[PDB]
Amino acid sequence: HMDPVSVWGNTPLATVDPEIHDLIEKEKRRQCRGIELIASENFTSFAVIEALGSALTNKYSEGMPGNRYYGGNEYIDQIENLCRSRALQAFHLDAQSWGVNVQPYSGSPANFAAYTAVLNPHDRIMGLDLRSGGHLTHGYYTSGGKKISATSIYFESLPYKVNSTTGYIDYDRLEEKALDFRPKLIICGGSAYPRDWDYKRFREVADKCGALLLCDMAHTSGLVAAQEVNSPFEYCDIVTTTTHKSLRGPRAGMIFYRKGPKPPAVYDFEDKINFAVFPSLQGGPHNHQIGALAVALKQAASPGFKAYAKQVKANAVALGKYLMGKGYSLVTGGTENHLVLWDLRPLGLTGYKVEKLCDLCNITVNKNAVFGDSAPGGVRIGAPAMTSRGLVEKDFEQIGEFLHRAVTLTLEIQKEHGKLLKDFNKGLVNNKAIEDLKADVEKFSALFDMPGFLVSEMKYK
Amino acid sequence: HMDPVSVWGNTPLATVDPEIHDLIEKEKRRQCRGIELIASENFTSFAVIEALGSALTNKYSEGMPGNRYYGGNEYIDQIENLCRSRALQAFHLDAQSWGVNVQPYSGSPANFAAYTAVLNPHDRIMGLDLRSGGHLTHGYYTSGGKKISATSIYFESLPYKVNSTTGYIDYDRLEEKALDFRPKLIICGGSAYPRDWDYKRFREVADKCGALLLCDMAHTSGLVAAQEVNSPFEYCDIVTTTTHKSLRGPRAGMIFYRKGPKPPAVYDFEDKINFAVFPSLQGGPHNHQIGALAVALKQAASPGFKAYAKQVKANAVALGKYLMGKGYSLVTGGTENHLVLWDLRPLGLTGYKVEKLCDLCNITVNKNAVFGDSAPGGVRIGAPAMTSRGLVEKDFEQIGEFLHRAVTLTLEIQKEHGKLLKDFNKGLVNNKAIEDLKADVEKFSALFDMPGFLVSEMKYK
Amino acid sequence: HMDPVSVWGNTPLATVDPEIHDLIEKEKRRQCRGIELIASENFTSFAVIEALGSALTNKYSEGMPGNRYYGGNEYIDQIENLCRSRALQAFHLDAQSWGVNVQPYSGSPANFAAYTAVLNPHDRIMGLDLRSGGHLTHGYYTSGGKKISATSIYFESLPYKVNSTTGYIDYDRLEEKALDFRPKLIICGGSAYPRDWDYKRFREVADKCGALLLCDMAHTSGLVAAQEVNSPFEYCDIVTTTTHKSLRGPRAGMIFYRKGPKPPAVYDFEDKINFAVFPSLQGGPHNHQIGALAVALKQAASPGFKAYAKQVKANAVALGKYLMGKGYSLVTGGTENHLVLWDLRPLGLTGYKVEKLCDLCNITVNKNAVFGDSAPGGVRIGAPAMTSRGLVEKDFEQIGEFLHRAVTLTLEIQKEHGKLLKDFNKGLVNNKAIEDLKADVEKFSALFDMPGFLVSEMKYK
Amino acid sequence: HMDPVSVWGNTPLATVDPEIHDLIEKEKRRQCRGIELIASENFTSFAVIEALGSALTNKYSEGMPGNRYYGGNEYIDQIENLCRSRALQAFHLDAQSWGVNVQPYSGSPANFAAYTAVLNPHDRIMGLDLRSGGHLTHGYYTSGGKKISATSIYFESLPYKVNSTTGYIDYDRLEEKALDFRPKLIICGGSAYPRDWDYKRFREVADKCGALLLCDMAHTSGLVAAQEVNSPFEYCDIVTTTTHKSLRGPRAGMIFYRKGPKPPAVYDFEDKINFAVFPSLQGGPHNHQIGALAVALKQAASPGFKAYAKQVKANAVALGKYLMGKGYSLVTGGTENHLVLWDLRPLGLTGYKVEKLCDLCNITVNKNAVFGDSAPGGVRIGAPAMTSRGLVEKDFEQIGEFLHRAVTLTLEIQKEHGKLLKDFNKGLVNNKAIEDLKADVEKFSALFDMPGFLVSEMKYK
Ligand SMILES: Cc1ncc(COP(=O)(O)O)c(CNCC(=O)O)c1O
Ligand SMILES: Cc1ncc(COP(=O)(O)O)c(CNCC(=O)O)c1O
Ligand SMILES: Cc1ncc(COP(=O)(O)O)c(CNCC(=O)O)c1O
Ligand SMILES: Cc1ncc(COP(=O)(O)O)c(CNCC(=O)O)c1O
Questions:
Q1: Residue A327 contacts residue A338 (beta carbons within 8 Å)
Q2: Chains touching D by CB (3 or more pairs below 8 Å)
Q3: Which of A192, A264, C13, D334 would give a disulfide with A133, using CB separation of 3.0 to 4.6 Å?
Q4: Measuring CA to CA, which residue among C24, C49, C30 is closest to residue C250?
Q5: Which of D58, D106, D283 lies at the smallest CB-CB distance from C44?
Q6: Residue A425: partners with Cβ closer than 8 Å, 6 or more residues away
Q7: Which one of the listed residues B25, B60, B170, B356 is annotated catalytic?
């Protein structure tokens, strides 16, 4: 006997799977009972979530709008076309000069799809070094030669670094490397770089060594959409990105590519990039993701989002100024985007130690490498998540006070117990000073609203 | 001025984005107002959709449960661990002998992650030929040498075909190729193969040529979970799959791998496959997909799903017997799984011609290559989608009657106008016989229930 | 104190290095005191040896004639231009349609230089299987996947085989493989194939799969120059060869390439092949080799050489007919070129066993694989070497009598001692029946003249 | 009718091929009627030439001594074994710690055979930049990305350069590159570097980045054998070389490799390198070259050669001091080996201009790139060739006087006519000052003896 559709197919989640429903409720509480400062995280809208969780997940639409393998894509084509036309207008792109593919399952697939389109296997790539604030998908191998990233497995990568004293990108060392290594593709953008990017200088370097210029604006896509940072579309041939970070959308990827006549002969990125996504690398697109993304791109083009992105920068600046006013060191001594990079080596601490104690106070940050590392000696702190909950400068200055108290309690424990990780941990068990900070954090966290779900109806406190 | 969280973050989709909401509603109507026979499609449960569209999309959990880069994954780890333990028990796998990774964004990423883990670039791969019913990600290049699939771009592929008269896999020609070509990996499983797979014979071939044996059970994962077809876990080293087809879950991928002591020395797939998914190829996992997948795997282990998979096989058989009783030819003359492959060359027709007229009657099938093609000459028809709506043998025999009438009207149009596409199309405009079939289809379609959403609350008719 | 030029630089070899001079004298005696039947060996002229051992070894002439890096190549250019113009006329090639590069250090470098010119790394190549009578540089890997040949290391190779019963090339199986594997280059020619090649059929196959057609005529270059076998220049794009085999020249290589307009648009092999030899792969050319080769190409274009090549075929035929008249089996039951392939499996023997006993009678042959091998079960016997010493059919029929007696004594030893290699060897020590054959061989060998050096002045008997 | 062996095989070269014999005679005159200063050239002994031009060219000996495919190698094995034992003692190598393979056809094949043995395709290599005085086979691609050298085609190369002001190897920039690029092999040695190599520093860099260390001592092999320069065997894992330069032997190659226990576990280079030479890359060895090489290695181990190598260094120093005493600039301001690198940019001249006028005075040098080039602006002048003819410091100081007059006439011509090549050439036609230098050169050249052949018996003046 088969179960009727009503029993298995229409019954709500809370009845079909109590375990998963209960676990999702605890995650919802965890997301609003603490302080989330992961620079790559955000809280998306309930409207995006509704499109994400819809019947759009049932449709196979292999191919592109108007050129699908299967029939019955009358509305999938309208949703995708709306999504890519919104993607272009959200970043103020003329359709005669720019095209976009909104089918990458995520940012990492978007980057590897861009590589396949414009490069052959073992072609040379240059990207920002991980320790300097770069990303894996830009190329990464260890000191022993172990090719960690797939970019360094199927292509030959070589990283350019920041100045080992100022923390800024060494554009003179970048040009020197690009002329020796002769990369076929140069990647700009990063995950923990607290300054803006000189895309015009990257263009001069790229032109000098005959390389294509790609920008991975994943972290700052929201700021780019609101024109709160430099636009890579003015100088790069290809722009890839995620959509779930500062853009505040679903987990997905996009690949922007130049179209039309080349500057002082027509660009031919469109077909290569479309073909790389499908049929080369990916199968059917996740239409529910594309529907949710179309919602996020319309929200990203609204005046409220421009104020949000402007607030994100002001909150990261206010947090950084508050930390430096307490004697703490920041890489480059400030920020021009959504995050600050906090150098903890001058304090005799490591990123892990501060990250672990902050997690025990429901303050979510991540240990991060700082220029001149040897054991990451810094923490990366981002503003988008809490800014999406309505926090402004005064609230972020209160976040700096919590971080101030967190590192102060981290030093007192290291002083009492030692600089040995094993010795350090012994000072966190039953520590009543942490529990008073955890409580001030939760109470401060619970004074703000939360997008995506209604707190009034959530199952846990 | 920033928009308050209530305005942008808590407002429902129907108000934030009327366009996308309206388009999703029409897709919902399209999904239940017609007859969906795409063998790779299904209608997932509302419980899966609720987990899919949740706050689980806000969390970055790069890494593995218990081995994450970031903190605050207390409940994400529980959701993922529950998902992998449910994946093992859904396929009756001993945890000491099998492991699974549930982070692949989709089926295509799962396969390429499996390749990266066990193979080096340019390693040789063998998979079922596309024209013989294989998949792109198993390897595909054109006759001009143009490497279409990424599997044939970063690896060296060579396809094995079916017997050009029986339509069955030529296992003697497979062994001959595997001994000449000496592949490092042999892939079994396909997208349009209507018979079961002799995994024991594939093991003999793999052992003879010293190759790893992988099975892509994407299409028949639901049947494998219910033990309605041969289990590849008894003879394959790695088993990859999608989760949104016969498994009736969300759009995602899984990679099963052997662990523990080797048969007549311990398997070492676990770390390679996990490392290939992250940090090599993918970034943060889509936790909402994993939550939705964990729900689907519990539904897949229920007695109702076991009856569903048995019904899928009975419906495809009943549909095939009905088509052969009307004089239509099927590849291999029947089916042992969820689909039938309908050879239309004996009728003087092409798959496209039949697919186009069926699309106008809201009958969704896909043109498909048939063994001995030179313009695909067949159509692939699947049972999972309509079977999930409660259709049984009698209903699928009525579906064959609709297909019978559809091809009968396709021959009458070709007879009157010709084999010229322009002339053929001319016979579909204002054709009243099609409108009588479409009307008979919709009315027949509207007599069944629908999973994922409640039809009583939908916006369109 | 430096040694004067007279002491170190002008003193003959017999005084400077007694060891090496004495060893060269013993090699000279070994070359004329026995019967040399290695199909790839020959005895070159004293004129070739004089040019080989000349002051031409002192000059660096990197580049091509008229486009050298260094000066002082006034006469090197004249020698090389004369060498390549003689190479074209020796093979009856119109200079408007064919070009040649005479700088490959040997045949193996010539083949790999041709590959580099027309192929990118990992491009697919097809060549005659080693066991079917092919060559390493055409591609070879073991059954375990060990890439033996550099052709299979830097390119992807796949061998085509002969019919496992007739011993002829399976052109239908060749076409089948070329259409599945889609090689970018197809290689014809071999080392132990006793029949001619259907180059027109190779052209049809190459055209069908869109591949370039190369012929490695190393073994039969002398027969091609005298037009005693099929000419590959009528159907192949590139022809590579050694010059020290049937061509009877020095150890070197040549690469012939098509020039001018393509048949029913102009060929562009010239610059790629010239560039691949230098500066890509090789350094300075061995001018002494090129001078010696120019001598050999003039000798190859003389009427005496055409009679020699015609005699080589007649001697190999007479030897084969004599062996088959004694009940011995030959692959394909005869020969159309310079060698016979003697299948010893019907006798219960292996090639090694016959080769070892023949070497003890100063009869030089080589064990060779025969179609359908599992321990090579055949011996390869060639005619050029002894034919260059003036032997005709009657003498080669006497060689068959010696081979007849050699295998008869090989069977008597296997009968008395056993089919175990260890047991077999025990029957060769102090065996007086071998010593009577060795003596008849030396006495028969010493009844003919020898090129390259004067036997009257040689140091040993 | 076949030609008897006496007619074609025993007739001397002067009768069989008058053209080639006449051209070889003119080359002999050219070699002794002028001044040869190509740093890569030398005049080998008549004993080497006699072994080079012998019956040793008739024998196929594929494999290794004692492990041959064919029989009848009793004396070829003795010649090769003597050659490898002489190679080891010529460079004072303990046979338990070092092995050598003497089958590379030339230096370029020796290097690529070493790469294949220890590296996989696309493995990273670092070598001295071509403009800084490196060699093609160490890696070379143009600024457009065009991979010129085969080393940069089948492997990924990156060159290290000299200091752009001192002209010395920048070992700090070498270590920086090796730690960024992470090469699997580092190559030391060059073609136009006038100083010695700090192999101990290369070992520190190699050990720091986990790379193998190879030295291409081709140019200075004679000086290494006489211990007149630093020995790379003390710090390198593999040492490759030519044998026809300062070693004063035939055109061939050798690959030295470490064996036995590793320094503070046993080296495994022996089998890989031997297998790479055969059967991977090369076919049958050129036994005549190995015989000639064995002769040269015995001459290289004689006290006369030790004095020769000491004289080569003294002559290059005396020539360099004479040029600097006339106000000419040398890279690094001197020399520690066999050559000087003459910077002509301070004179307003190019290397080509000086090379062309020197070629018209029968002074053979080569234009060469100098550190900081943008049209090579220097000339490379070597001492081995003329030193082998008995020239000492006083004679090389007279060579500098000729070079002084040559460049003085080059400036006088540039002054009168201009820096336009057409105008410059116009000053060399009927120029009586050049004819007075040519006459002074020939008469000076004809006052010295010549190795390889007896001048008393030569056909031309
Ligand atoms: C056998 C098989 N394996 C993997 C995949 C990849 O699934 P994704 O779309 O998630 O990449 C497919 C797609 N099947 C498409 C079809 O049969 O119509 C497939 O058929
Ligand atoms: C700059 C950048 N680009 C691409 C990606 C890939 O996104 P996916 O995880 O969806 O594949 C990331 C992930 N950034 C992760 C972090 O910084 O925390 C990223 O930081
Ligand atoms: C340092 C070095 N190594 C290897 C080679 C290769 O030698 P072959 O020509 O045998 O391939 C050369 C050529 N030296 C050329 C020159 O300096 O003029 C070389 O200079
Ligand atoms: C057909 C063929 N082509 C090329 C070569 C290479 O020649 P070199 O050894 O000079 O590299 C050989 C060697 N033939 C060896 C044999 O059959 O005995 C050959 O047989």
A1: no
A2: A, C
A3: A192
A4: C49
A5: D58
A6: none
A7: B60
d(CA B359, CA B341): 18
- Could you tell me if B274 and B368 lie in one domain? no
Pocket of ligand 4 (CB under 6 A): C 40, 106-108, 135, 137, 189-191, 216, 218-219, 242, 251; D 60, 282-284
Cβ proximity of B351 and B314 under 8 Å: no
Q: E strands of A144-234, at which residues?
A: 156-160, 185-188, 212-216
Q: Which residues of A touch D (CB under 8 A)?
A: 122, 124, 141, 143-145, 156, 158-159, 177, 179-182, 184, 209-210
Gyration radius (Cα) of chain A, Å: 23
Q: Which of B28, B44, B71 sits opposite A364 (nearest CB)?
A: B71
Q: Which residues on C lie below 8 Å from B141 (Cβ)?
A: 182
Q: Which of A120, A156, A164, A207 to mutate to test the interface with D (most CBs of D within 10 A)?
A: A156
**Domain limits at C326?**
303-457
* Cβ-contact D241, D217 below 8 angstroms: yes
Angle at which helices B351-360 and B393-417 cross, to 10°: 110
Catalogue the E-assigned strands of B120-216: 124-128, 156-160, 185-188, 212-216
Active-site residue identified among B216, B228, B270, B355: B216
Distance CA D23, CA C290 (A): 12
Closest by CA to D187, choosing from D211, D166, D204, is: D211
Quick one: which H or E segment has residue B49?
Answer: helix B46-52
Does any ligand 1 atom lie closer than 6 A to the CB of residue B104? Answer: no
Which experimental technique did the depositors report for determining this structure? X-ray
Any domain includes A29: no
CB atoms inside a 10 Å sphere around CB D260: 13
Q: Point out the residues of C that are catalytic.
A: 60, 62, 216, 242, 245, 251
Residue in D57, D61, D62, D105 to alter for ligand 4 test, most ligand atoms within 8 A of Cβ: D62
DSSP string, A413-449: HHHHH-SSHHHHHTTTTT-HHHHHHHHHHHHHHTTS-
Half-sphere exposure of A3 (CA within 13 A, CB side): 19
Q: Are residues C89 and C63 in the same domain?
A: yes
Residues C415-449, buried b or exposed e (16+ Cβ, 10 A)?
A: eeeeeeeeebeebbeebeebeebbeebbebbeebb
Nearest CA among D91, D452, D40 for reference residue D300: D91
| A252 and A372, same domain (yes or no) | no
CA-to-CA separations, A1 to A5, A215, B198, B225, in angstroms, rounded: 12, 55, 30, 17
Distances (CA, A) of B211 to B202, B208, B214, B357, C444: 10, 8, 10, 45, 55
CATH assignment of the domain containing C386: 3.90.1150.10
Interface contact flag, C106 D284, Cβ < 8 Å: yes
Query: Residue A162: which CATH number?
Result: 3.40.640.10
Please state whether beta strands A238-242 and A212-216 pair in parallel, antiparallel, or not at all (unpaired): parallel
Nearest CA to ligand 4 atom 20: C191
On whether residue C277 sits in a domain, the answer given is yes
A161 backbone dihedrals φ, ψ, rounded to 5°: -115, 170
